[PDB]
Write a protein that binds this ligand. Structure first.
Ligand code: BR
Ligand code: BR
Ligand code: BR
Ligand code: BR
Ligand code: BR
Ligand code: BR
Ligand code: BR
Ligand code: BR
Ligand code: BR
Ligand code: BR
Ligand code: BR
Ligand code: BR
Ligand code: BR
Ligand code: BR
Ligand code: BR
Ligand code: BR
Ligand code: BR
Ligand code: BR
Ligand code: BR
Ligand code: BR
Ligand code: BR
Ligand code: BR
Ligand code: BR
Ligand code: BR
Ligand code: BR
Ligand code: CA
Ligand code: NA
Ligand code: NA
Ligand code: NA
Ligand code: NA
Ligand code: NA
Ligand code: NA
Length: 223
């Protein structure tokens, strides 16, 4: 997250860190058994880390649970990043509490102009590199589909939206991938892609979760 703020420990209780020896992506806890992330975050060997603030220090509220199954969307295209969503089932259920909690799925899509909260452990610099140890947060608006297309001609599908600031300076970044965009208490987006981070006229691009609710629910029901 570039241009954001320190969230505070456990103030984003649905935020997960995906670990394969090191943090590599975010995710969102949607019930005790299941996490939603980006398909481009797929790997074998995922350990889901819940209750994290400092990802490098045990602080006492963590739950470390191996993934049993990873389900990449059937129509995921890694060249176009269309359908950039994956479900991860936990080998055992999380213990839900005030610091480890699920985020509701949307019953309709959110509109342009809606403020959302985007969070993660990704890079905090637009030119440089610098990876934080504690969770970072950014409040940002959903952009118009027309502004999004104009920013990334030929690239924005019906399963994508933009959020952030056309001026630059405030965006998600590398290492935030797979994490949440929450608006009015519902998971509306997954950190998916962009051109660099926090560049002018290059806002973040997010998977449009509302298009996937039926697939999420049916897949959880059957797995
Ligand atoms: Br801060
Ligand atoms: Br739940
Ligand atoms: Br401790
Ligand atoms: Br486990
Ligand atoms: Br299973
Ligand atoms: Br397909
Ligand atoms: Br590819
Ligand atoms: Br292709
Ligand atoms: Br269990
Ligand atoms: Br507990
Ligand atoms: Br607690
Ligand atoms: Br639901
Ligand atoms: Br909703
Ligand atoms: Br809708
Ligand atoms: Br917000
Ligand atoms: Br910062
Ligand atoms: Br940093
Ligand atoms: Br729009
Ligand atoms: Br276009
Ligand atoms: Br909220
Ligand atoms: Br919330
Ligand atoms: Br959505
Ligand atoms: Br720039
Ligand atoms: Br679908
Ligand atoms: Br749906
Ligand atoms: Ca920790
Ligand atoms: Na990929
Ligand atoms: Na644990
Ligand atoms: Na495609
Ligand atoms: Na806003
Ligand atoms: Na830090
Ligand atoms: Na399309």
């Amino acid at each position: 997250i570039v241009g954001g703020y320190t969230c505070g420990a456990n103030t984003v209780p649905y935020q997960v860190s995906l670990n394969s020896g090191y943090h590599f992506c975010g995710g969102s806890l949607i019930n005790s058994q299941w996490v939603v992330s980006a398909a481009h975050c797929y790997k074998s060997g995922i350990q889901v880390r819940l209750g994290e603030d400092n990802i490098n220090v045990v602080e006492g509220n963590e739950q470390f649970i191996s993934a049993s199954k990873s389900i990449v969307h059937p129509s995921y295209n890694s060249n176009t990043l269309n359908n950039d969503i994956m479900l991860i089932k936990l080998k055992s259920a999380a213990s839900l509490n005030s610091r480890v909690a699920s985020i509701s799925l949307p019953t309709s899509c959110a509109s342009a102009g809606t403020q959302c909260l985007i969070s993660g452990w990704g890079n905090t610099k637009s030119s440089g590199t610098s990876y934080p140890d504690v969770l970072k947060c950014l409040k940002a608006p959903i952009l118009s589909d027309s502004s999004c297309k104009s920013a990334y001609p030929g690239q924005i599908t019906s399963n994508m939206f933009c959020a952030g600031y056309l001026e630059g300076g405030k965006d998600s970044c590398q290492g935030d991938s797979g994490g949440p965009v929450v608006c009015s208490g519902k998971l509306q987006g997954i950190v998916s892609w962009g051109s660099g981070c926090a560049q002018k006229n290059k806002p973040g691009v997010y998977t449009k979760v509302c298009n996937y609710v039926s697939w999420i629910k049916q897949t959880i029901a059957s797995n």
